Structure formats: structure tokens, C-alpha cells
């Protein structure tokens, strides 16, 4: 956890408010993975 992670949760929390728009929900929504790497050599990718 980082200060930006902390704030990222906080924005997500503030929209939890009674009003919202299409870009807000997207700004907090991720269906994204990340691939681990070292050295070509890789252990398996895992949800980000």
C-alpha cells in the first residue's frame, strides 16, 4: 500500500456517492492483469 492507493480507495469510497456519472465508475474499475518478469524469465501473471 502507497499514499496513491490510499487516495485511490478514498475516491472509490466518495462515489459510494448517491450521485455519479459514467466516467467516475470507470476511473475506479479495472479488469487489468499484470505480467511478472525478471532477469525473459517469468513467474506466472496474476490479477493486478
Amino acid at each position: 500500500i502507497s499514499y496513491a492507493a490510499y487516495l485511490n480507495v478514498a475516491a472509490q469510497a466518495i462515489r459510494s456517492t448517491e450521485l455519479q456519472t459514467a466516467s467516475v465508475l470507470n476511473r475506479s474499475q479495472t479488469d487489468a492483469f499484470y505480467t511478472q518478469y525478471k532477469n525473459a524469465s517469468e513467474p506466472t501473471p496474476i490479477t493486478k
Binding site: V9, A10, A11, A13, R15, S16, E18, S23
Partner: protein
């Protein structure tokens, strides 16, 4: 002057007093405020120009008064009337999550945001 910017929308300010809640208690800026750096917590923010007041609901960010009379405000969210009850339900689910398990940190942000909301 005062700025508001978000990933998805830009806000343009002029402004006389800006009133802020920061991780050092509470900070006020009126005319030229001598430069201070505090990162803004989950906040209810008020701006007044003249005897008009305008209000904003802010998710936290960073604040920086620069010497020339310019309050650079950035936040990921941060209008107040626009923001607007399901957070209590979200709190109950966060309490469940902690039992098994970030989930701690998420429920801590929810409680922090819920006290702040009750002020409205």
C-alpha cells in the same frame, strides 16, 4: 484563484478565501496565504468569493499555495451537493471482509469517508 481538476473533467476558478481540511488539522487560505504543503484528507471544502459561497466534496489530494495568490488543488474527485447513502451498507460488507482478510485499509477509508459525510 483556485483550480479543480479530475481525470475525467476540468474545473476553472476571483476566489477570496478557500477553506480546507488537511493532515495537520485544518488550514485556511485567505488572500495570499504564506506557502504551505499539506496533502488533503477526505474532505468537505468550501470556497467563498465575496459573500457568495460555493461548496465541494473532495476525495483528498494535495493543496499548494504558491506566492502570487494561486491555490493549486488536485484531487481524484473533489461538487459537494452533487456527491450525495449506500456507504452504510458498504461498511457492513467491509466488516465481513476483515474477518477473513487491504480489506482492513479499505474499511478504514470507509469509516473515514462516512464521518466526513455525516458533516454534510
Amino acid at each position: 484563484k483556485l483550480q479543480f481538476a479530475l481525470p475525467h473533467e476540468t474545473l476553472y476558478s476571483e476566489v477570496t478565501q478557500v477553506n480546507l481540511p488537511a493532515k495537520s488539522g485544518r488550514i485556511g487560505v485567505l488572500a495570499n496565504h504564506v506557502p504551505t504543503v499539506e496533502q488533503l484528507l477526505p474532505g468537505v471544502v468550501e470556497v467563498m468569493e465575496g459573500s457568495n459561497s460555493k461548496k465541494f466534496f473532495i476525495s483528498g489530494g494535495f493543496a499548494t499555495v504558491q506566492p502570487d495568490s494561486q491555490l493549486c488543488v488536485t484531487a481524484i474527485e473533489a461538487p459537494l451537493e452533487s456527491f450525495s447513502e449506500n456507504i452504510k451498507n458498504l461498511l457492513a460488507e467491509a466488516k465481513k471482509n476483515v474477518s477473513s482478510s487491504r480489506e482492513a485499509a479499505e474499511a478504514a477509508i470507509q469509516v473515514e469517508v462516512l464521518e466526513n459525510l455525516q458533516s454534510v
